Design a protein around this ligand. Structure first.
Ligand code: FAD
Ligand code: MTE
Ligand code: QUE
Ligand code: MOS
Ligand code: FES
Ligand code: FES
Lengths: 164, 745, 305
């Protein structure tokens, strides 16, 4: 009666045999897959704590496209044949940090740390599309990401390092 | 020795990789259930019936819980004036009536929505104005008075009088309230994982609720994704309900609030109303001041009394006022009980002070910097509460900020922009602050630590303070590393827990570094003294060899450390005794451009000079200054909570409540820490930094007022010495309407 | 690429692979909700406790994703993400004379501080349009510009410029039960045609009382004499409305201080708010309607200098 949902998370095949249409990707990542890096901060698309990168072959444009999305509003049933990247998909203190992770950490851009994965994924996405962005492109990537702790200055300053 | 070095936050790398564990990231037990609060939709009403029929049809529904389920006691809250679960009557929208427990959080959400309550509405009191009209107050009038008021006013060249309102603020910690409760099944024992700044009250309120000794309850706090005062007491609303569910079911139970529940239920900063009368000389010299403060406390006392006390202690800001009377009252209303929010009543009182100070300057037709400077305290001066200002560094901060911000040159250029532009105006203001350091309740100024050295020489530090992003654990590691004379890599802090350090004060009042720093230091000293003989026996040996020798000689490598802040004890009866240990000082200068036609504005530049003594960690301390400043900029310029007339909150998420974004911060944002200003009163000459910078946010508000003043001087009745009321927050609505023109008319 | 069916506790979701499936499904289930970005529906289900037991996701259908550059304008499939619309329009703006991109520029101004990248990469054009929030930032621009909507059901097809009649009442649009929105042609601007858009930058209520507008003026060839004038506002009623009465009066008047105060007089009466109007901020909102027009007035003169 019911079809299989197949997607990928951090390079790994996820085969959901009983997808519920109501299930969000945030719920799936956190509570089925056990990938708790992606956070719930509002559930209404306004804070970006739940930011992940989505990737797919665009039949029209021909290429693979990469973009950021709020996992709190993404129904898993929209993700058939899509590839999800989370904060744990890009680097780890157990293996090696991604440069985006190192620089936000070392630049004092993370205080309580709850917005950090979301902002990391916003910057990371930007770099997957534009490896040499401008300062303006950098500020722009974060219009969907809130931080209550840092006053934002350190985050931009650490990421400015990626421009020119 | 890293003390004074910009060591990054110890957890930042793991925070960036998503490896740092927050409460809801803890894995679930196989049998773990989920709780969701069932809450009042009425501001004031009798509960007639509760019908759970529909909830019971939801897949995975376990139970509904209410006041009848509680084994111990339904009375809770700091002053024992709250219910855990409301019984006959609700007293605010958001008031907790019960909880559903289900097998998934989605099922608990669904079941909670379908719980049907029947009410009979009773008449409600929502506004401060309503509360005053009904004499609906908690306790009696608070008052600080000094000098002769009916002498000062008799003598004053002029007076200014008026009324000012400042709206509240939601904490908007990125991680909302969260508790996991694990029932052990033996002797009422329960272990709780909680996003709270107050593991002591959590522990005590759970035990009281359950009817069980406090020694049965273990509360553990790894870290919070922000607290800001909001998890200092209101975290128990979730914790106690979760404990009850664990007790009833015998299963582990968790709850993390959705943002909308959190905004409605858990309280925010206190809104303040002030009526004031200031008397002054033609010179701008203040001769008398009378201020009556009113806070909107909501539907319980909570911390409201202490928040008003702090307001009263800061109604002077940095100004000497020979004759002064301040009063505070706490308005009892049908709103969620309001609570601690970074600043704890200080920013409200300081804002009231800068508001009339700004009106004094306009009335006398003098430059604002000149009137502020000429009224400033001097070294050795006493405050209105009769405490001496020792090491009063505002004059240095002021002078250095003026110089480095190029204030006088840019003030010229602001004036040129204003004469050359019709429908956009620039403003520029420079504001000081002082903020007193200590809990104003003397008994909270105590701190414990517990340190173990294991036989490999690694050190485990435990102290009563919690980490919420402010880098307290980092600072304690730098302290211990310096005190033990070993590198930071040998030392670890895992968590805060009631079984390692009991009876801890909430992590609050900006004093945590000072008091836990001292506790940690004393414990380290004890360790060094015990190790000293072994050092002498093996002088060219290593830390590890000394520890192992001490171990084998049966010398204990475990110790407590304790600090009690000396010489605190202010009396409202005698208007004497120190209320604070010392003060933290700062000055900010901010420039804005407003759009006269839309009420929008751009923050152009801000320069801050902050006295934090000799910083333990300049990077953390600057980070604290910038964070606090931006929270203050949000309080005064962006964030607005809005209620229906029936008292129900409209603004319940980031789409209707705007905290500062990446684009809200000043384009040029400079922060310097005052150099060569050691503080004899705290650990390693440092000073508390967490809360004192927030009010500097007001510099953006007074820059806005300055720009509105120019817009009015262009388009309305032209009196240079014309005053108008601008409440906080200065939103686009208020800014626009105040730019009276051919369109507003 | 084939049709997928997913079944949960309360909801059936069908991922439609072709236009025919979509139209067939929408005929069979007239009430079905079409989800693309889910940035509206996910909110209605979580926060308004709405239940929609039948969902059709058309995001895969090539026709709902097509970007087409024609003689009259640029046509976007209804499922095109707002970031795609933005990128296509930013590309057209950099390539075409300024006089052909006045509307594109307005759309781009509304898109600027409109959420963040995450929402804009998944929010559809058709989604913002059919949702029909009183405070939609795009509907007033589309209305003011007469952006053309291709609406399709099983068998039948039509193309209507968006006008005031398209939003009859609260959160309703003029599509029949079996119909879907297929594509949206955003027009190039004409010689002597100028366009602005503005929006309020706070807001405290869920989907009311945030002033947002599209403004369009078409002058007689080489004149300052009004031939067509359109002023559409969101945040002023239960729906996107046009100040028809006010603008009708300006037809064949000249663009002068007289035009200004008359429009500001017309706006004040036509769009007047009762003191009990949902969302409050009555004085502010009124003032913005005139202040926005005044900005448009001034910008139109500079664009004529
Ligand atoms: C945090 C955030 C910020 C936002 N800010 C703004 C803003 O500033 N200005 C603004 O205007 N909006 C704003 N929005 C709304 C956003 O623009 C809309 O939510 C989005 O365009 C809806 O598109 P969707 O694909 O996500 O719709 P969905 O949620 O998937 O569907 C929305 C509605 O459109 C219908 N629909 C979709 N496609 C068709 C079709 N082709 N034919 C017929 N009906 C169809 C659906 O049935 C449903 O009723 C914001 C939303 C979020 C979450
Ligand atoms: N990142 C961050 N900084 C913060 C807070 C927070 O929750 N997160 N709370 C503030 C408040 S309300 C206080 S009282 C102090 C408490 O910490 P301290 O005493 O260790 O400075 O930190 C402040 N700075
Ligand atoms: O955070 C604070 C707090 O909790 C309390 C308090 C008061 C009475 C109690 O019974 C209690 O448990 C706490 O006082 C304070 C006093 C301050 O000057 C500053 C603070 O930040 C607090
Ligand atoms: O004293 Mo901070 O928790 S308000
Ligand atoms: S949780 Fe806030 S945007 Fe997804
Ligand atoms: S570091 Fe705390 S919210 Fe960003």
């Amino acid at each position: 009666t019911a079809d299989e949902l197949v997607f990928f998370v951090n390079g790994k095949k996820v085969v959901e045999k009983n997808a519920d249409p109501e299930t969000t990707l945030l719920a799936y990542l956190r509570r089925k897959l056990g990938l708790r890096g992606t956070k719930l901060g509002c559930g209404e698309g306004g804070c970006g704590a739940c930011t992940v990168m989505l990737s797919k072959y665009d039949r029209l444009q021909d290429k693979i496209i990469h973009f950021s999305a709020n996992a709190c509003l993404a129904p898993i049933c929209t993700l058939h044949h899509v590839a999800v990247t989370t904060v744990e998909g890009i680097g780890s203190t157990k293996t090696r940090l991604h440069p985006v992770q190192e620089r936000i950490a070392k630049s004092h851009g993370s205080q309580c740390g709850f917005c950090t994965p979301g902002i990391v994924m916003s910057m990371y996405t930007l770099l997957r599309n534009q490896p040499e962005p401008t300062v303006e492109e950098i500020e722009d990537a974060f219009q969907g990401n809130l931080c209550r702790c840092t006053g934002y200055r350190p985050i931009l300053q650490g990421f400015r390092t990626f421009a020119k | 020795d890293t003390v004074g070095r910009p060591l990054p936050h110890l957890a930042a790398a793991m925070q960036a990789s998503g490896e740092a564990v927050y409460c809801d990231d803890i894995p679930r037990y196989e049998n773990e259930l989920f709780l969701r609060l069932v809450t009042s939709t009425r501001a004031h009403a009798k509960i007639k019936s509760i019908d759970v029929s529909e909830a019971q049809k939801v897949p995975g529904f376990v139970c509904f819980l209410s006041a009848d389920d509680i084994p111990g006691s339904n009375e809770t809250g700091l002053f024992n004036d709250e219910t855990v679960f409301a019984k006959d009557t609700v007293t605010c929208v958001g008031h907790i009536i019960g909880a559903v427990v289900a097998d998934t959080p989605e099922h608990a959400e669904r079941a909670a929505h379908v719980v049907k309550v029947t009410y009979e509405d009773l008449p409600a009191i929502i506004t401060i104005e309503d509360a005053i009209k009904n004499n609906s107050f908690y306790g009696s009038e608070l008052k600080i008075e000094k000098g002769d008021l009916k002498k000062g006013f008799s003598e004053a060249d002029n007076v200014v009088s008026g009324e000012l309102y400042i709206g509240g603020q939601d904490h908007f910690y990125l991680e909302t309230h969260c508790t996991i409760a694990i029932p052990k099944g033996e002797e009422g024992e329960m272990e709780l994982f909680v996003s709270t700044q107050n593991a002591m009250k959590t522990q005590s309120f759970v035990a009281k609720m359950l009817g069980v000794p406090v020694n049965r309850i273990l509360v553990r706090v790894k870290r919070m994704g922000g607290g800001f005062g909001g998890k200092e007491t209101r975290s128990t609303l979730v914790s106690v309900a979760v404990a009850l569910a664990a007790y009833k079911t015998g299963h582990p139970v968790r709850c993390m609030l959705d943002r909308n529940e959190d905004m409605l239920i858990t309280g925010g900063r206190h809104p303040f109303l002030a009526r004031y009368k200031v008397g002054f000389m033609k010179t701008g010299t203040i001769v008398a001041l009378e201020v009556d403060h009113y806070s909107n406390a909501g539907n319980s006392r909570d911390l409201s009394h202490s928040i008003m006390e702090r307001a009263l202690f800061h109604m002077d800001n940095c100004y000497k006022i020979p004759n002064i009377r301040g009063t505070g009252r706490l308005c009892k209303t049908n709103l969620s009980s309001n609570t601690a929010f970074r600043g704890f009543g200080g920013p409200q009182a300081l804002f009231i002070a800068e508001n009339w100070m700004s009106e004094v300057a306009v009335t006398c037709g003098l430059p604002a910097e000149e009137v502020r400077w000429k009224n400033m305290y001097k070294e050795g001066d006493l405050t209105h509460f009769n405490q001496r200002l020792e090491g009063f560094s505002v004059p240095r901060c002021w002078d250095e900020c003026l110089k480095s911000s190029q204030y006088y040159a840019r003030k010229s250029e602001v004036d040129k922009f204003n004469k050359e532009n019709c429908w956009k105006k620039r403003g520029l203001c420079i504001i000081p602050t002082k903020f007193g350091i200590s809990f104003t309740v003397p008994f909270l100024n105590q701190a414990g630590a517990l340190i173990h050295v294991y036989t490999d020489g690694s050190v485990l530090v435990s102290h009563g303070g919690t980490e919420m992003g402010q880098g307290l654990h980092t600072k304690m590691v730098q302290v211990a590393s310096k005190a033990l004379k070993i590198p930071i890599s040998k030392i670890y802090i895992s968590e805060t827990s009631t079984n390692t350090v009991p009876n801890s004060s909430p992590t609050a009042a900006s004093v945590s570094t000072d008091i836990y720093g001292q506790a940690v230091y004393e414990a380290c000293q004890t360790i060094l003294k015990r190790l000293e003989p072994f050092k002498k026996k093996n002088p060219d040996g290593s830390w590890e060899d000394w520890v192992m020798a001490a171990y084998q000689d049966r010398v204990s490598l475990s110790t407590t450390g304790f600090y009690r802040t000396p010489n605190l004890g202010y009396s409202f009866e005698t208007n004497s005794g120190n209320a604070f240990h010392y003060f933290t000082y700062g000055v900010a200068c901010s420039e804005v451009e407003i759009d006269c036609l839309t009420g929008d504005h751009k923050n152009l530049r801000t320069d801050i000079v902050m006295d934090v003594g000799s910083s333990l960690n300049p990077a953390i301390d600057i980070g604290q200054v910038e964070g606090a400043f931006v929270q203050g900029l949000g309080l005064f310029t962006l964030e607005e909570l809005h209620y229906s007339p029936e008292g129900s909150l409209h603004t319940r998420g980031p789409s209707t409540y705007k905290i500062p974004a990446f684009g809200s911060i000043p384009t040029e944002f400079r922060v310097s820490l005052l150099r060569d200003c050691p503080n004899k009163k705290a650990i390693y000459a440092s000073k508390a930094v967490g809360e004192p910078p927030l009010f500097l946010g007001a510099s953006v508000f007074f820059a806005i007022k300055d720009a509105i003043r120019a817009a009015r001087a262009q388009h309305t009745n032209n009196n240079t010495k014309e005053l108008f009321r601008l409440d906080s927050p200065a939103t686009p609505e208020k800014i626009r309407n105040a730019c009276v023109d051919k369109f507003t008319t | 690429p084939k049709q997928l069916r997913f079944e949960g506790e309360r909801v059936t979701w069908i991922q439609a692979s072709t236009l025919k499936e979509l139209l067939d499904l929408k005929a069979q289930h007239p009430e079905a909700k079409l989800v693309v970005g889910n940035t509206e529906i996910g909110i209605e289900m979580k926060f308004k406790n709405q239940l929609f037991p039948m969902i059709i996701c058309p995001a895969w259908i090539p026709e709902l994703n097509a970007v087409e550059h024609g003689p009259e304008g640029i046509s976007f499939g209804a499922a095109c993400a707002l970031s795609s619309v933005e990128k296509t329009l930013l590309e057209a703006v950099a390539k075409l004379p300024t006089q052909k991109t006045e509307v594109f520029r307005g759309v781009l101004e509304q898109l600027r501080w409109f959420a963040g990248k995450q929402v804009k990469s998944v929010a559809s054009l058709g989604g913002n349009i059919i949702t029909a929030s009183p405070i939609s930032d795009l509907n007033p621009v589309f209305m003011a510009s007469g952006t053309k909507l291709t609406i399709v059901s099983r068998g039948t097809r039509r193309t209507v410029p968006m006008d005031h009649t398209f939003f009859p009442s609260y959160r309703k649009t003029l599509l029949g039960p079996e119909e879907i929105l297929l594509s949206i042609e955003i027009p190039y601007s004409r010689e002597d045609e100028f366009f602005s858009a503005f929006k309020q930058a706070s807001r405290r209520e869920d989907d009311i009382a945030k002033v947002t507008c599209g403004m369009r003026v078409l002058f007689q060839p080489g004149s300052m004499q009004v031939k067509e004038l359109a002023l559409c506002y969101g945040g002023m009623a239960d729906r996107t409305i046009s100040a028809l009465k006010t603008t009708q009066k300006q037809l064949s008047k000249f663009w002068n201080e007289k035009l200004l105060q008359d429009v500001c007089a017309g706006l004040a009466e036509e769009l007047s708010l009762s003191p009990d109007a949902p969302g409050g901020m009555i004085e502010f909102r009124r003032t913005l309607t005139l202040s926005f027009f005044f900005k448009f007035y001034l910008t139109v003169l500079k664009k004529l200098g």
